[PDB]
Design an enzyme around this catalytic site. Structure first.
Site: not given
Lengths: 225, 225, 225, 225
Positions: C9-11, C93, C141, C146
């Site tokens: 995930n490149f966010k 997310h 998650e 995170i």
């Protein structure tokens, strides 16, 4: 709304919930009568109707998100606020930011209903934008100071001064008040000296061991200027 | 929460605002005592405290968006609901949809505060997801039928059927109720015959010429069971 | 989607924006071919089309909020994701939580378009609710971890075990992957060992001095177990 | 941004998705070159980077919700827009209304980043509040006319006139453009005669059988004023 104003925002504090909401409103009411000052109270939504029917000082809703009554489950409409006995509404508080488009409609509807309307904004520029919507007053409140006891009038006076200047240059019918960190009568007097027509506060009154005494202290500067 | 339940959602209807909220709640209270049925009332936020202190039937909040009291201007917290005299909360109603993540947190919190919790859902699948969160009840409510007088139990009984099936298959402790378009006692009886443990309605009761009489009509099937 | 999966995930990281998005996706692609492992890439929305047309590994959208194309300025629709060349979508997310009602529709629509769909959830109970909606996979998650480097599989393995057990007991078709804090090939292997069918990560890969090397390290366990 | 402007908003239309985004942008670029007019393009988020790297006319993002890069999965930040090759951004379009407070920060951040910024508003008063924030331009766009083919410049000219008057009265440095319903070169001409410095449109261009020809028709009035 009456000229110099002091608005006590109960927020969602347990100290001001349930019956405490009415007790707090009554202490505010006594102080307003003893000082001849316009002290307004904003209880949480759940107590708005109850508080409105228990005191005669103006009672403001902490916010609203819908214009008219109807099928809006769990929403607060301006018309319902009026029907519950409210005299005004606070919109766009830092803790309940609103969409610019809704805010514009909410300010207009609230006014056509005879409700006082105060629009909060974090800084001068946003305050100018809120003022362009035509509320009775705009409350500039630096969110960083909210709840810190470090008064905007002493720690960040430029924000007050710049707001008063911007607003008086563009929409002078709109009054400017301020809030965030106000804890003493001096913080209040400092606000008025900076050009403000009132103050908005929560902690200091809501959490005071002696609400009536504290509120008298906070409102006293209004009956002096 | 009490076994078979009838929840009257006042939404933001002017016909149930202000003093009318208390009047409607009282009519519901009479009916409840007369029939020995659990009739619950959900007034708009502004009248929740007032209504809670005026009747002894359970009073539910139409929604909440925050867990605990604090600096949450214009928000409705579960603790404040409890402090206001409320006994439960409706969550995720079609007119006030919630994020799944907040919803999971609000359900648990509400439960530990001793609040009854009802989570609404648009269809069987979403209702199944809601039931996974553990509320006392899940209310399957087709948004298309809301406010149309076309009772879900008559026009979309499959939606009730599939929900009762899925939830009973996966989370049997969670009760299932339904709503949308219920206008008569027969609609209520039809809903109960489909495996429901109660009903959620607004229009029929709120806009009735004779609230008491209408509510007795609507609630009667709960006692006949 | 392909069996054991690793999703990068490149966010919205600048280290993965603009042309860097393509560079990072290509390093991922090399690693995938080198290891015979399914490595998936999720660039920020602005680079989705560009990246999709630059690599052959699956490219997932970081999220969506609308089902079909049309007048939805500034929105991301599932159909557009497919038309842009995407093979899947991540939904809910922690950084972009969704309304339950919308989430349900988005998962169903995304599946009907032939898109892979992964739904994130903060904990087991919420992961279960997400699973009930039918995505191909649910990614438990813990938000506390995170971006911290403290892999979920090291410090909160229970969250994985419980999610795996709950989902397999209710919706066995739904696969379980995990994420948050995964920084090494070892955290990855730990994840797989705990019952996971893959992993979701961002920091470790996006901020690595040598992306290719780092990604190879992270993906390697997918070929081993 | 450049003097008189024509902005083609692709919204989330399938007719402008995937490769079609680049095709459309190129047709726009040709028209711009043929006429010596500033034609700007706003593709959906997913194609922004791709389109930016395929044409030399300015490419604007349809919106943003975050200021800087970072851990904002599924969000569009202003920095990422710049990193993707964007020249500007449209904020607060009717289909993506924003909070005043966010709007204020985003406008400021965009300018600081060197990005052009346009803020949409539904009416004059809201446009005036928007102009108080200081964008390069404000786009008064009646939501009821969007996608209807009934041009704002023909059906609601008062809205444009009032906005132009109010904005030049308070924030003369902020330009005004308008949009909604525009389908012909005549509608654009009429908009410019009302004091506007440009136009914002979607349907007419996006759904034209001959984009290039249509865009030339629509942009032609800009080369004549």
């Amino acid at each position: 709304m009456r000229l110099p104003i002091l608005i006590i925002n109960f927020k969602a504090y347990g100290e001001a919930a349930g019956k405490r909401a009415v007790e707090l409103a009554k202490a505010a009411e006594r102080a307003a009568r003893e000082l001849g000052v316009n002290i307004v109270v904003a209880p949480n939504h759940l107590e708005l109707g109850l508080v409105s029917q228990s005191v005669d000082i103006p009672v403001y809703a902490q916010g609203a998100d819908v214009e008219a009554g109807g099928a809006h489950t769990a929403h607060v409409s301006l018309e319902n606020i009026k029907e519950a006995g409210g005299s005004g509404v606070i919109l766009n508080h830092s803790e309940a930011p609103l969409k610019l488009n809704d805010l514009a409609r909410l300010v207009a509807k609230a006014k056509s209903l005879g409700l006082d309307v105060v629009v909060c904004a974090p800084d001068p520029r946003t305050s100018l934008a809120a003022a362009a919507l035509g509320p009775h007053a705009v409350a500039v409140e630096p969110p960083e100071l909210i709840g810190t006891g470090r008064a905007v009038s002493r720690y960040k006076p430029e924000a007050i001064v710049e707001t008063v200047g911007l607003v008086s240059r563009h929409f002078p019918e709109v009054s400017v008040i301020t809030g965030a960190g106000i804890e003493s009568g001096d913080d209040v007097a400092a606000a008025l000296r900076l050009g403000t027509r009132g103050v908005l506060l929560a902690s200091a009154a809501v959490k005071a061991k002696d609400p009536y005494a504290k509120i008298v202290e906070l409102a006293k500067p209004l009956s002096e200027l």
